[PDB]
């Protein structure tokens, strides 16, 4: 199951077989696009974007009112970020850990957990960088972690 904990668990989303509209709805493909573009200005990232549509607007999902994903729509403009938010959130966490570690050198538990989250960055990086989604010279270090999260 879990990749750095021993646990096992199910909580996965389950989609219906259907996939019409379904009937009840509005905002033709085009309407949904301009509704999205406004949100990305405000710093709402693709995961947040689909949530804020699904909770309060008439969409089931933005993959059955468009022929594309949420991210590809943003990418066609050129307004997509230069690294995926997934990678960003890993790096975002580990800097605060390193701050706490400098403030407290006797928190061996934090030091331990850092080894996991550190190694999990490098594995993820080796997906993107082989697929030509990152430069083949980019590496993860303390210095590059500081600058890239800011």
């Amino acid at each position: 199951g879990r990749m750095h904990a021993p646990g096992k668990g199910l909580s996965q989303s389950a989609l219906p077989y259907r996939r019409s509209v379904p009937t009840w709805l509005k905002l033709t493909s085009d309407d949904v696009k301009e509704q999205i573009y406004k949100l990305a200005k405000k710093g709402l990232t693709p995961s947040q974007i689909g949530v804020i549509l699904r909770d309060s607007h008439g969409v089931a999902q933005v993959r059955f009112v468009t022929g594309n994903k949420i991210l590809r729509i943003l990418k066609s403009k050129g307004l997509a970020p230069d690294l995926p938010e997934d990678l960003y959130h890993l790096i975002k966490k580990a800097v605060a850990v390193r701050k706490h570690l400098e403030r407290n050198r006797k928190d061996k538990d934090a030091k331990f957990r850092l080894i996991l989250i550190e190694s999990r960055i490098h594995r993820l990086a080796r997906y993107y960088k082989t697929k030509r989604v990152l430069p083949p010279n980019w590496k993860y270090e303390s210095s590059t972690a500081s600058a890239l999260v800011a």
Binding site: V51, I52, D55, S56, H57
Partner: peptide, 13 residues
């Protein structure tokens, strides 16, 4: 006439 999802996850305004 608002339409809202059952598991809101966020405040609906």
């Amino acid at each position: 006439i608002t339409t809202v999802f059952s598991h809101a996850q966020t405040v609906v305004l």
